[PDB]
Amino acid sequence: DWRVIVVVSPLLIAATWAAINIGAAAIRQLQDVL
Amino acid sequence: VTYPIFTVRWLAVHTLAVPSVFFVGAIAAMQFIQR
Amino acid sequence: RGWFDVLDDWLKRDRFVFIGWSGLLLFPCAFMALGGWLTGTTFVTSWYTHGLASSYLEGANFLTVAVSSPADAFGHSLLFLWGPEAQGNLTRWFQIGGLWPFVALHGAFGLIGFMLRQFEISRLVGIRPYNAIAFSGPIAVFVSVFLMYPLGQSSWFFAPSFGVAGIFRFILFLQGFHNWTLNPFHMMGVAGILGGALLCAIHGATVENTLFEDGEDSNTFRAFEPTQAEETYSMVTANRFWSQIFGIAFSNKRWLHFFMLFVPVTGLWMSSVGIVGLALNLRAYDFVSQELRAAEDPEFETFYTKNILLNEGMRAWMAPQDQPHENFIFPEEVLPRGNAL
Amino acid sequence: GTTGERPFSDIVTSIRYWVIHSITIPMLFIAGWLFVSTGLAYDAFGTPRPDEYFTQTRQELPILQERYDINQEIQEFN
Amino acid sequence: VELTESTRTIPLDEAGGTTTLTARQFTNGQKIFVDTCTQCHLQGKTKTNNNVSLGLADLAGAEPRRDNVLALVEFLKNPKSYDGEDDYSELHPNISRPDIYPEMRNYTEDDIFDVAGYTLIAPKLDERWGGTIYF
Amino acid sequence: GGRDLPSTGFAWWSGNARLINLSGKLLGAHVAHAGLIVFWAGAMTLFEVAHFIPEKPMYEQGLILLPHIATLGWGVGPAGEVTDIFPFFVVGVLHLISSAVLGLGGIYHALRGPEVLEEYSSFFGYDWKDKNQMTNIIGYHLILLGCGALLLVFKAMFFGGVYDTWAPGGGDVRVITNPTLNPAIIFGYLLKAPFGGEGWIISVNNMEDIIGGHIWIGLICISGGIWHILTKPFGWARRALIWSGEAYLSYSLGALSLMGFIASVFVWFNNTAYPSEFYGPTGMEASQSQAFTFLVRDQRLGANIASAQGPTGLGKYLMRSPSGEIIFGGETMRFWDFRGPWLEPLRGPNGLDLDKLRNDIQPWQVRRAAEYMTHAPLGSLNSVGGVITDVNSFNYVSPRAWLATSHFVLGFFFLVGHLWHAGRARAAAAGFEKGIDRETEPTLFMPDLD
């Protein structure tokens, strides 16, 4: 269903933008807690 | 100085606020549904 | 370090949102209940259970939306998503009103988790658990109204719907069908709630108007620090004022605050006992002496008999729409009505 | 006073926070918008669109009366 | 269902003629009904005289019958009594007397056609159309 | 000039209390707020004109300012028909431009003028304790208020007149040539009971009475203005009153509360200064109209409306008031004191006359009664007309309902303001507005009550 694609895809864009703007500090916080 | 970013407080905020903004956008689109 | 004690350490950290052992019951259940209510009032109809529109998707507003009660045909079926009605179909589950037992059950277990949270944090901080004892009132209300009232009735249909106008419907329904204003248990509830509101207002006004001059600013709020030892307001002046104004006054701070606890909690418990009675249609509907007299004497009218007539009119004009599963066909000539209206 | 977490007034007054949210919050808004405007919410929840409250063969209220076979009941109700 | 053509198909005259309104014509007739008619004809009743309501049986029982478009248009030009005997031009709102009814002096003939079409379609959308004041 | 709470002792939510002893900034706040009032008047009038269908009744369109302009006799003719759109637009434009001027002046005094006016001039410099200067300002404002009352009188007498709803031939803009200068009538309006059938000053029923009262009000206000400018407060006034800025504010709040209550009752009951052609019928007018409408309809059906008894034994259409006047029956028996220009033609010396009801009812009275009955001041908050059990198809709430409700709410909250400021003024002049001194707590030196 194209409806499912065009509904999920905005969430995917939001998640990937948050990931590529927070991922360095996210991996650092994951490392510091082992 | 050098606070954590991802906490229980972070998840507590998003669990509520991410579907809140999703639902608000839904109801905003509902405002333009014709009979 | 045992794994239980390590988990106990993690659950009871001093963070922004306290979790605790009670949080494992509270947070998923409260989230499920709140998300179910918001989901139902945003997207889910009551068209097949009630013949009504009750979501924002259908054009209802914040007053007119509800997670409405399920269809009367299901009885007191718990209406699980995997249950024999819905049979795993989420869409069918939404349409048959399964969001109502979803919200009501998760809400009830979340209320349990919240009073457990009150107990847990009271134990950790080191205070007495009177906040949980006070919260017993709201849980008594929720259990009697949303659970034992429909259980005593024919189905979950006659439970209150989780909505503003749906609750107003439940309220008017209980007036017209049960004469719930006439019930003394509700009168004690009303007395408790209005007394709690009175005590709140009077206690706040008395403290704010018997404050000690403990600062140089006209803004009196900065004349307090939490770690101070002495009282921020004059109990002696407050006592003298209310003794000369009202006749009596509080002379004990601890008794004052226990009474502020006691009045609305007792009101809630009393109204809950009345709702338990109403679950079995054990109403204070009538004063039989006045009906026997009114049936014998057509000159006898009180405000009670007028209220009885109001209830009959409401029942006859509301029941075909309020109970569409019954297929109540009331032709216009049988509807009770006064002259010219 | 501070339990350990970053204070909210520090967080929401940052460039990086608003760089992430200038994107996340409006695009969640448009996700809800496309949930409603593509009509997927009607199919997901079983809510009637404004022309399926009544069909050409049913003009009364489709009050469920079945206790177990409600799927076929909703189907013949349409 | 939709606002179908069968919902908008209404009798045009006494001789079996029918006209089908448009969606725009129905919307305009509804808007005119909200603006000028509903103050006395809310939900098809008549608050001033509910013996003569806007119900379809009421419209059919008039002399001549007012269940068609041209009859309602004629009543909105020259209103009469229910039996057609008396003159209601000074008592019912109309388009032939702009001196005493200025709220309808800016209505064209097509506007009267639209409001008559709405007056014939609205009874089959509401079952309480033309009932008792409190119904 | 302290603009923070350490420099003033007032928090931001009480921050205009920092202006109490800063006269020039206080003058700026006032002028700026005055500009707000004139701005709303102008912009709301422009909105009402832009949302005006002039062939439609004003009460049907949610207008409250155009009825006020039309009552003064601007742009209207017989029975309130709008002849000219332009005077309403002129009144709007004038207020909007004067508001721009007033806002510039208020912002100047509030942000660049002398913060205190007592170091610049002894005329505008005021100390709150200075009883003579405050009475001078009372006197100035009194002189200008009397001039405004005389300006209304000049409009009604020499500038085209005002709308008289009671005028022969129907209501019209007529010139008041004989205002009642009789002090008996004018001041016995003040002694009439504020109850049913008397109505205090709400029952003022003719434009001559209103205009004569405004001549008296203008004379009284100009005389009192010259009084407060020429005299100092006497010893009884100085010994009874609190003399401080918060005290004078609270006195004015009590007066404003009184005036808001009176205005709500005035727009609800009076149809002379609030004509029903512009403000719609009153509740009493609509109920009497319903009774009259169904009297006319059933009389046309051949019913004997005099001898028709209702289900209760009272007359269905006609009955007696408790003093014996022939009045309409039904629940409207309670509205039997209603007087209106459509109904006074059918009233004899004993009440509603049977001969006039039998053979003197005109079609315009029938039309007016049907319109007023169907425009009763009953409506939902969302503007759905009729009784609240009606469905959603009639977009109407009466301007009388809006005005009465608003001004009753404002009058109540201004009574609350009077109580808050009268009490705080007394507490502050007495010295215990900040709380009880611990060393000299007054109750600690009193005997026990028992």
Place this chain on the structure above:
Amino acid sequence: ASLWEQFCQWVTSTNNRIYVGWFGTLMIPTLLTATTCFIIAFIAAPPVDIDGIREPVAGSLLYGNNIISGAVVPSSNAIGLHFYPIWEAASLDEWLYNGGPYQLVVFHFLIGIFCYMGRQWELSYRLGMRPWICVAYSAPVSAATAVFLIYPIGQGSFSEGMPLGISGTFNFMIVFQAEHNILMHPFHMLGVAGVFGGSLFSAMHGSLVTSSLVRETTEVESQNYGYKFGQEEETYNIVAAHGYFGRLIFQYASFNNSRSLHFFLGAWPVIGIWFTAMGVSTMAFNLNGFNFNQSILDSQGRVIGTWADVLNRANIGFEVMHERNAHNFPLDLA
């Protein structure tokens, strides 16, 4: 020295067991008059023709009522807003028939409670208090004035004022809903927020103070004996209560300043009751609650019901049966 000054000193005395004051010199006669007439009318008044249609309603205990059904019945609809004292009646029996006791009780009671509010200010001034307890009392006063005075004025008859009885109050409320849809009025909703929240916050405040009491008694005696009247020190640990409540919700949702907490405790139910008093006072002028009846239509135009439509069915059933014999015309204009 003077007799008048001696009387003024007695009137304004803080050593009176019950404070009189100048507001009390009006309060005490009006309240005693209203109390005496209310008690006599509640026990033994004859039936009252409230609707003005010669259908007298038995209100008193001696005429077949109980405590729940008993009321001082409002004055006649034939009177309307007319001033009806005893001396305007031809006899006392006529005065009783037309509901004169209700007018007497209500007018003296309203003067008395306004003077109670003035007296509360007066005693706060004589005791060196801050003066705003009377502002908090102005919310029940406004509600009482709304149901006994303002609603009769707007409706045009003192027969529309709330009856002075329990079942009479229920009758007032039900007719109010059928006519004004008060449940849909947001001012009543704010009132329900006020009373529910006031009771909530009363329970919260009381439960937190009782929870954080300082140990000053044994486990045998009542804990209230841990407080001595006029003690300087605090009887409970506010910091402990704040730690509990800022862990129960989160830290910044809890008051730590007791003065802000008590101002909130005063302000919430007072503002709620102010709003509901104004709601009843504005439905006096028929500005009613929201009308959402037939607000949702399908694409054909058929009405889809909501819960407001079921509420309207209940309102219609209440309306068509109310004052069953008083209406002669199709619309209940007031």
